[PDB]
């Protein structure tokens, strides 16, 4: 009910960027509230984002038919993961709150951050088909995305040329974060930061600092509870028969991905209900 | 269907293993197109040991503003001056030549592998791949066709409307619309190979044969539906919003236009998976 440890993952090469200023603003605001703040500035760490056989520090189980998921899980169980992955996994294990600070790039996370998820979020460590989504290993943790874009807010509105931002956010927030157990908080969306005058930029930094004063007390984003599904291969991980019947009486879909051919609830991936 | 002899294909592969089904699919695609007279070029990102990280090392000469580095403006300027790193230039020349672009990858964390995401970031430079002046429909790759050939760990049912992962059409949207279509590409129906780890040996053989059979007449296919850019007022003053007349015509519709342009309505079935 009180958050004490935070991890800030930053994905920007420039110490001069607004992204770096947002990482500094976050670290300062949380430290003032008594949090222990740990950082993963991917570029300053020269983080290797590419999965490979070298992520296993020893012999492989089946090198003739190398399969990264089974091999990396085995290396995790045996303590044979590459020390750079182990150090990141320790940061995650200690954190209550995880902040991801990054510029939106090609409607997703920068490649360096994509590879950080790929090499760090190893099976059993971060996810398991035995405890999916709300039952996941990171269920006691909270995650938040703080994103800057080149495009304006209107471009990402329902009627905007790029389409709904809620759709762009879904694969990261549900698929990457929520699948691992994280309760996902409302994203900090900083639109067209390149076309924002100096006065407003100072205020964006202060607004983010003020939000972080009570971040742990916020209501997280709504995702469909895992209890609504038959979480086993035989049923095909499909929504329960009774839930399918009950949902026929629902006007809106449960979320973006669980729209069910119905209207998506307004800002399902942007605002808590 | 119509002959494509001498036409050009680029296969971008994102898998390190020669023994992978992804590599098998790349080989099947190259053999099928070559049999139809296509000129086939590949970008095996792991074999190339492709640098996937955007940095100032992507520009060879002097920068416009080295104390305040901004990748978009610096990379565009480098493209205009022909000062992009040679590895980027070699990939941009492969794309320029290609009529058809196949992206062969295993689905990783509900998107493209980091190496392929890095390829998009370093290769798809402004002016070369996109402009705010000619977004989406009018984009530089409007004469080209792109196709995703994806393999997944999860079954088809996990990615169905009622599946635990949610609708696959939503996962596909940021790649197909945001990356490919924004650049002008006509996007073809994705080749989706679900739970390839659970597929029996005879079924895996027939997935390869089915892919080869599809590539025999791929250029003749109807592309996926995206809302035309002509429905929007493409400028800052209008905020790149749908035209008033389009908004009025949409009020009594039950269905939205696409995944991204769902407009608070019902998404048409398989908008990112099946063409109309
Ligand atoms: C590969 C690539 C792909 C992209 N794809 C997309 C896409 O899909 N969608 C999209 O919308 N955009 C896209 N973009 C644009 C991108 O999201 C923006 O360029 C980015 O968000 C800008 O954020 P920044 O941190 O780099 O800011 P900067 O450009 O570095 O900074 C913005 C301003 O803030 C100022 N600033 C810095 N520090 C401070 C401080 N302490 N206090 C106040 N002001 C400060 C700077 O001086 C500058 O004036 C893409 C960019 C790249 C490189
Ligand atoms: C970091 C990471 C994240 C992931 N995230 C996700 C996710 O978000 N969603 C998801 O659903 N999955 C996810 N996965 C799973 C991933 O999509 C699968 O592991 C992958 O698609 C398997 O395809 P492959 O090419 O590696 O095949 P392999 O596992 O290498 O092989 C599959 C089968 O094909 C056989 N085969 C190979 N060549 C031939 C041939 N010529 N003819 C016939 N059979 C052949 C093999 O022997 C094997 O039986 C993730 C995996 C990783 C590494």
Author numbering:
A (entry chain A): 0 to 272
B (entry chain C): -3 to 272
Question: What did the authors write?
Answer:
NQO1 is a quinone detoxifying flavoenzyme that catalyzes the two-electron reduction of quinones to hydroquinones. NQO1 exists as a homodimer with two tightly-associated flavin adenine dinucleotide (FAD) cofactors that reside at the deepest point of each active site of two monomers of 274 residues. The two active sites reside at opposite ends of the dimer and incorporate residues from each monomer. The normal biological function of NQO1 is to protect cells from the mutagenic, cytotoxic, and carcinogenic effects of natural and synthetic quinones.
Crystals of hNQO1-FAD (holo-hNQO1) belong to space group P21 and diffract to 2.0 Å resolution. The asymmetric unit contains two dimers. Each physiological dimer is made up of two subunits that are related by a non-crystallographic two fold axis. We observe unexplained Fo-Fc density in the active site which does not belong to any of the possible ingredients of protein purification and/or crystallization. When we try to model benzoic acid in this density, it refines to partial occupancy (0.5). The crystal structure shows excellent stereochemistry with 96 % of residues in the most favored region of Ramachandran plot.
